[PDB]
């Protein structure tokens, strides 16, 4: 028989990651697990065909069933509009989903003992907690076509004072302008999730902002974190001999670079996006990073890879050129989603399966079978020969055989 | 005097640890050898408070007049600084004020010593960041939203045509924060030109990072302006020099930079240039080993500075009687880069030599094994550093002064 899995929302994506997603389902998931699978095609063509409604439907399903696993998707700009003959420049599906669900996206490298790092000192993990809501990812931006005034206005619902602020008087020429925002409740949730994560690991917590420049906007993040620390977590931190500190973002990225690792890093939405790619690459590869959205309700999660659709590799695939794209992050999206589904349902056999999936990945790499990005970590990209790595399909096949043998040997 | 006649330089004095080092540089390395027409503006936090920040605006206008400014790091106050100095207001960053007036691109690059290991294994060639100096978060209008209500952003054309209003957010429960920011086409164009010109002058490829998939209009404008200027002015020159230009999304770019061998110009928007220049400095060795020069669009006016701040944490050690070992090199190169530009403008051969000698002394001293604790930790690892591995802040300044005196004496 197969493992009885329960309800999981699956979102299919684009380009190289869509292909890998198909390989993962066929070789690693479907032969072993039967799921009540609620599938949503978030491929760019289906999003366009449905006027992006499929994205909103998917987010609602994640809230209902509490577990989503998402493949990387194209976020279109003008070049993608021309490529796919799109009706609109659709918004990022990740931004739409995260805007609805809220929460914190936690990202962490996937570590193999035989893979050298690019950053010499990082002997312990760095976990980024990326605030998943607002800021640049729900902004209202526009081109200023010529001379004129841009202003921003707040009108309270309760008929107290309305306030209009000058953004800029464009005296010559035009430019660009934007408004963005965040919400107190969302920032509070983000603080709680950061403090709880630090206590769960027994590691210090650092929050980064630029509150010397954005004194009101970023100052609010710093103030809410400090109030929540003092009122809810200071004594527990002191019990575990860990600390909480706010640092300016430019100081903090330098401190991270020279650290030994072993800390939680609470990042605003944009910083979390950018620095999670820097951290993933510092440890090894973007293909070796986990990403999980933990919603404030303590039960809903969305797992994904931190990287995109790997367009550059897909262009090689389209030309029939051999590719070696790392599928591990995509595989860990499935394993982390299934592990959460099993934790919610006390599903012992699914818990075992999800862990075995992750173990097979690490064991395969550490035994010396890997894609080109990891071979380059070991050898250096100049010294990498074709015999040092497997292409994407050979690697998927090797994982498939190693998983089959692990599940067989366990029963 | 028989000193080098150096000409007119605008000096802005600063705060905390860098203020201490700044005075040591002037007394030990500059004033013994160079006579300057020095236009000094005290941008210390107490004097900015006493002048209601007017000293900062006056300094910026002086840089416009004399074309050369050298700036010490300054405190940008938040609420805690208001309390510590009993400030009248939460003053704006002086860097932001000066850059907003001058415009241009801030170019940042590590200062490389052959005996100093990197934290990033692959960076064998230089990475030069060109940070757009104007606008975005550093000229933003931000505010607390005290409760439910609507935030909207409006554009009113100057020529009387129809005003446009866009919703930013309808706050339905609780409050939050909101902000507006902007940038100007002319400033973006100047940023593009300076970036393409730096790439051609160094002979390296150029990369622009944005997040135009998310900020499709705002960041798309940067991407479009760069591409149109590249196509119509620089592409044939790039191809002749066998270099290229590419736009990349910022999160891809930071990973590409991490695994690269170096050897590229990196055009960054104001905020990214701020953050990633600290990441790059640390990756090569230390925040104390990075140059920073604002190059204005007029092709004549520059403001040189260190990329790091006032090093408050070391200043607190100094205040409590604990030995400090703060790296002065970036501050020294602020002087040397400023004086080099002064000399280029004036065709002042002796001053050009002096400015280069100053930089050579710094490198030669560290390579000879005399260095502050940050660089000793690069070599040994911080847990293995012993007091005999490094010099304290004043000892290192003295050693630089001895070596500079000796170099200039031999030169004659
Ligand atoms: N979560 C998401 O849905 C998400 C995230 C980011 C971007 N995107 C979309 O993805 C598309 C491509 O964006 P992008 O090219 O900037 O970013 P990307 O897909 O993350 O790829 C950037 C580069 O990182 C490396 N890389 C990433 N994932 C890898 C993997 N699994 N194995 C090996 N190398 C890997 C490759 O470097 P080399 O070229 O050096 O081999 C690749 O070209 C865009 O349409 C973007 O909107 C979506
Ligand atoms: N250019 C400017 O005017 C400028 C730039 C940035 C910040 N600031 C102001 O500077 C003040 C302090 O900011 P901050 O603490 O975030 O940043 P910072 O002054 O850059 O110092 C951050 C940390 O970087 C290291 N570091 C920086 N410069 C160093 C040097 N020359 N030698 C050795 N180590 C060095 C030290 O790390 P360790 O503690 O690990 O030794 C230091 O504590 C704030 O008031 C801020 O507004 C101004
Ligand atoms: Mg990203
Ligand atoms: Mg900075």
């Amino acid at each position: 028989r197969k493992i009885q899995g329960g309800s999981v929302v699956e979102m299919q994506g684009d380009e190289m990651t869509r292909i890998i997603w198909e390989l993962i389902k066929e070789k690693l998931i479907l032969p072993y697990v039967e799921l009540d699978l609620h599938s949503y095609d978030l491929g760019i063509e289906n999003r366009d065909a449905t006027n992006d409604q499929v994205t909103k439907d998917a987010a609602e399903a994640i809230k209902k069933y509490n577990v989503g696993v998402k493949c990387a998707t194209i976020t279109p700009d003008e070049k993608r509009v021309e490529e796919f003959k799109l009706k609109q420049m659709w918004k990022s599906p990740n931004g739409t989903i995260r805007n609805i669900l809220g929460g914190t996206v936690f990202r962490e490298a996937i570590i193999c003992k035989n893979i050298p790092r690019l950053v010499t000192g990082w002997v312990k993990p760095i976990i980024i907690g990326r605030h998943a809501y607002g800021d640049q990812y729900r902004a209202t931006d526009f081109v200023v076509p010529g001379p004129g005034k841009v202003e921003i206005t707040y009108t309270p619902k309760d008929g107290t004072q309305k306030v209009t602020y000058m953004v800029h008087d464009f005296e010559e020429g035009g430019g660009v302008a934007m408004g963005m925002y965040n919400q107190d409740k969302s920032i509070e949730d983000f603080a709680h999730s950061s403090f709880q994560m630090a206590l769960s690991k027994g590691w210090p917590l650092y929050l980064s902002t630029k509150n010397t420049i954005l004194k009101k906007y970023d100052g609010r993040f710093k103030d809410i974190f400090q109030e929540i620390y003092d009122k809810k977590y200071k004594s527990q931190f002191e019990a575990q001999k860990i600390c909480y500190e706010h640092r300016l973002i430019d100081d903090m990225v330098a401190q991270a670079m020279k650290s030994e690792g072993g800390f939680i890093w609470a990042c605003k939405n944009y910083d979390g996006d950018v620095q999670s790619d820097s951290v993933a690459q510092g440890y090894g590869s973007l293909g070796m990073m986990t990403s999980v959205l933990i919603c404030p309700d303590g039960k809903t999660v969305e797992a994904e890879a931190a990287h995109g659709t790997v367009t550059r590799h897909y262009r090689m695939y389209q030309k029939g050129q051999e590719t070696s794209t790392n599928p591990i992050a995509s595989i860990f999206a499935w394993s982390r989603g299934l592990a959460h589904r099993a934790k919610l349902d006390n599903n012992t056999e699914l818990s075992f399966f999800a862990k075995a999936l992750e173990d097979v990945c690490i064991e395969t790499i550490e035994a010396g079978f890997m894609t080109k990005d990891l071979a380059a970590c070991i050898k250096g990209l100049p010294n990498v020969q074709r015999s040092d790595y497997l292409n994407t399909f050979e690697f998927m096949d090797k994982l498939g055989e190693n998983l089959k043998a692990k599940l067989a040997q366990a029963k």
Side-chain angles (χ1 to χ4, degrees), chain A residues 118-139:
Chain A
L118 289 174
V119 176
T120 58
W122 290 349
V123 295
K124 310 168 162 184
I126 295 171
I127 293 173
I128 282 170
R130 168 185 175 189
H131 186 202
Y133 179 88
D135 294 352
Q136 292 91 334
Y137 300 78
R138 201 71 182 182

Side-chain angles (χ1 to χ4, degrees), chain A residues 273-326:
Chain A
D273 184 19
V274 173
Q275 302 312 139
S276 66
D277 277 8
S278 176
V279 168
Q281 191 67 64
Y283 279 100
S285 175
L286 296 192
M288 312 283 286
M289 176 144 264
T290 52
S291 183
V292 58
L293 172 74
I294 303 171
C295 304
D297 67 351
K299 65 191 334 292
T300 302
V301 310
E302 181 214 9
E304 87 211 326
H307 58 73
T309 67
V310 207
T311 308
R312 288 178 200 269
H313 292 199
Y314 181 68
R315 300 297 184 220
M316 291 183 315
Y317 185 75
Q318 289 184 303
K319 300 172 195 285
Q321 288 156 28
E322 190 177 51
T323 63
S324 192
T325 310
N326 189 338

Side-chain angles (χ1 to χ4, degrees), chain A residues 177-196:
Chain A
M178 68 180 281
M180 57 185 213
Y181 63 96
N182 219 304
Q183 292 192 156
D184 279 350
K185 192 33 164 219
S186 187
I187 298 167
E188 289 157 23
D189 294 344
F190 170 48
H192 285 283
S193 68
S194 299
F195 290 118
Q196 291 166 16

